[PDB]
């Protein structure tokens, strides 16, 4: 063991957190989202048509400019809530800061304009389990464990607020004590295969409203917002007094700071987010509407129904993902 490597992340306005990786010899670089909610790796491809204008506006992998390439070409499709991305598998040598692994990844040749014209990232790196991976394709953190290079079989996340500075920082093989305070509070996974833990309550003010008897909480580094079931979120947004719109929830900007705290009850402690954490205070005007960084999503079986504690949450709490001990550690971020 003994190794620990830390990649550095750009924060596009608290909604996209991406960092650099290389593919090939010589390396071709890609801005990518590291995603505990998924297990596959992909980037856009040469063989993407120019019909897909998402591919025009992103960096493309070219197989023919890597001496380490290893054609497979098996079809791959990846479902996200905003439609799918399709491509073919291939293999090449991938660099993640200081670590280099031979990895099987997807070359996307169908990349929709919704959502990806708004995407500052090119690709995604799945940090979930092979159980979740499409194809039973060995995920990248499995292969990094296989190497016996890491100090401990863990990785961890730091998301900062967008101040205008350090955007964020993933750390493979451990955690950065400079970006959290106190010690970790650890919570064992329900089961292997999903970065998903049991939640024992969701509370507004002192009044514990929902998940009273218990429910699951997926810990999702690829998610921008906290999310819950539609029936959970409507009961939450009713309590907060937020209006719905086509796709998000809003409040009058002047009301934001007076909104109640939201507490999530995890491994015995409560994990509190104040209106400062969960609102986008662009102004404090009565004349404007400010978005809450929370929304509805009914994640299907088997993974859901479940809450997803995305970036809105991780910003406040540094998150270690323990693959050795099949648990998650939380700690007040700084």
Ligand X SMILES: CCc1cccc(-c2c(F)cccc2[C@](O)(CCCNC(=O)OC)[C@@H]2CCCN(C(=O)CC3CCNCC3)C2)c1
Ligand Y SMILES: *[C@@H]1O[C@H](CO)[C@@H](O)[C@H](O)[C@H]1NC(C)=O
Please give the residue ranges that form the binding site for ligand Y (CB under 6 A).
71-72, 74
Which listed residue (14, 35, 92, 122) is catalytic?
A: 35
Closest CA to 292 of 325, 268, 259: 259
According to DSSP, residue 152 is labeled: S
* 304 to 333: interface string for ligand X, x by CB under 6 A: ------xx----------------------
Would you list the DSSP string of 112-141? -HHHHTT-S--EEEE-S-TTTSGGGPPPHH
Q: Compare residues 54 and 93 and give the one whose CB is closer to ligand Y.
A: 93
Q: How many whole angstroms separate alpha carbon 252 and alpha carbon 23? A: 46
Report the nearest approach of ligand X to the CB of residue 176 (Å): 18
Which listed residue (14, 92, 122, 220) is catalytic?
A: 220
Half-sphere exposure of 42 (CA within 13 A, CB side): 28
- Based on the residue annotation, tell me whether 220 is a catalytic residue of this protein: yes
Q: Which of ligand Y, ligand X, none lies near 262, with the C-beta cut-off 5 to 8 A by kind?
A: none
Q: How far is CA 180 from CA 176, 243, 312, 319, in A?
A: 7, 35, 16, 9
Report the nearest approach of ligand Y to the CB of residue 74 (Å): 5
Q: Which of ligand X, ligand Y, none lies near 74, with the C-beta cut-off 5 to 8 A by kind?
A: ligand Y
Q: Is the peptide bond preceding residue 65 cis, with omega within 30 degrees of 0?
A: no
Q: Which of ligand X, ligand Y, none lies near 296, with the C-beta cut-off 5 to 8 A by kind?
A: none
* 69 to 108: interface string for ligand X, x by CB under 6 A: -----------xxx--------------------------
Q: Are 3 and 99 in contact (CB under 8 A)?
A: yes
Angle at 217 between CA 279 and CA 19, to 5 degrees: 65
Structure tokens at 331: 């700690």
Report the nearest approach of ligand Y to the CB of residue 66 (Å): 16
Q: Considering CB under 6 A, how many residues would be counted as binding ligand X? A: 22
Closest CA to 120 of 26, 41, 13, 196: 13
Q: Compare residues 75 and 212 and give the one whose CB is closer to ligand Y.
A: 75
- Is residue 119 near ligand X by the rule CB under 6 A? yes
Closest CA to 64 of 110, 28, 21, 103: 28
Which chain residues interact with ligand X by CB under 6 A? 15-17, 33, 35, 37-38, 80-82, 115-116, 118-119, 124, 220, 222-224, 297, 310-311
Active site residues per annotation = 35, 220
């Amino acid at each position: 063991g003994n190794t620990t490597s830390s990649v550095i992340l750009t924060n596009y306005m608290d909604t996209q957190y991406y960092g650099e990786i290389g593919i090939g010899t010589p390396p071709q670089t890609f801005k990518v989202v590291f995603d505990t909610g998924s297990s596959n790796v992909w980037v856009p491809s040469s063989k993407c048509s120019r019909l897909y204008t998402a591919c025009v506006y992103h960096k493309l992998f070219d197989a023919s400019d890597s001496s380490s390439y290893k054609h497979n070409g098996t079809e791959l499709t990846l479902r996200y809530s905003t439609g799918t991305v399709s491509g073919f598998l291939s293999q090449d040598i991938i660099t993640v800061g200081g670590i280099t692994v031979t990895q099987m990844f997807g070359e996307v040749t169908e990349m929709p304009a919704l959502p990806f014209m708004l995407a500052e990232f090119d690709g995604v790196v799945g940090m979930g389990f092979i159980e979740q991976a499409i194809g039973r394709v060995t995920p990248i953190f499995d292969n990094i464990i296989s190497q016996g290079v890491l100090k401990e079989d863990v990785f961890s996340f730091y998301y900062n607020r967008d101040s205008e500075s350090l955007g964020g920082q993933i750390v493979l093989g451990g955690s950065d004590p400079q970006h959290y305070e106190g010690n970790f509070h650890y919570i064992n996974l329900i089961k292997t295969g999903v970065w998903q833990i049991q939640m024992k309550g969701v509370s507004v003010g002192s009044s514990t409203l929902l998940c009273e008897d218990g429910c699951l909480a997926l810990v999702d580094t690829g998610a921008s917002y906290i999310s819950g079931s539609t029936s959970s979120i409507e009961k939450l947004m009713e309590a907060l007094g937020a209006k719905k719109r086509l796709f998000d929830y809003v409040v009058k900007c002047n009301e934001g700071p007076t909104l109640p705290d939201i507490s999530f009850h995890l491994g015995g402690k409560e994990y509190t987010l104040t209106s400062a954490d969960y609102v986008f205070q662009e102004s404090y005007s009565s004349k404007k509407l400010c978005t809450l960084a929370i929304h509805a999503m009914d994640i299907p079986p088997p993974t859901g129904p479940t809450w997803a504690l995305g970036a809105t949450f991780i910003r406040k709490f540094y998150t270690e993902f323990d693959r050795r001990n099949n648990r998650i550690g939380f700690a007040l971020a700084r």
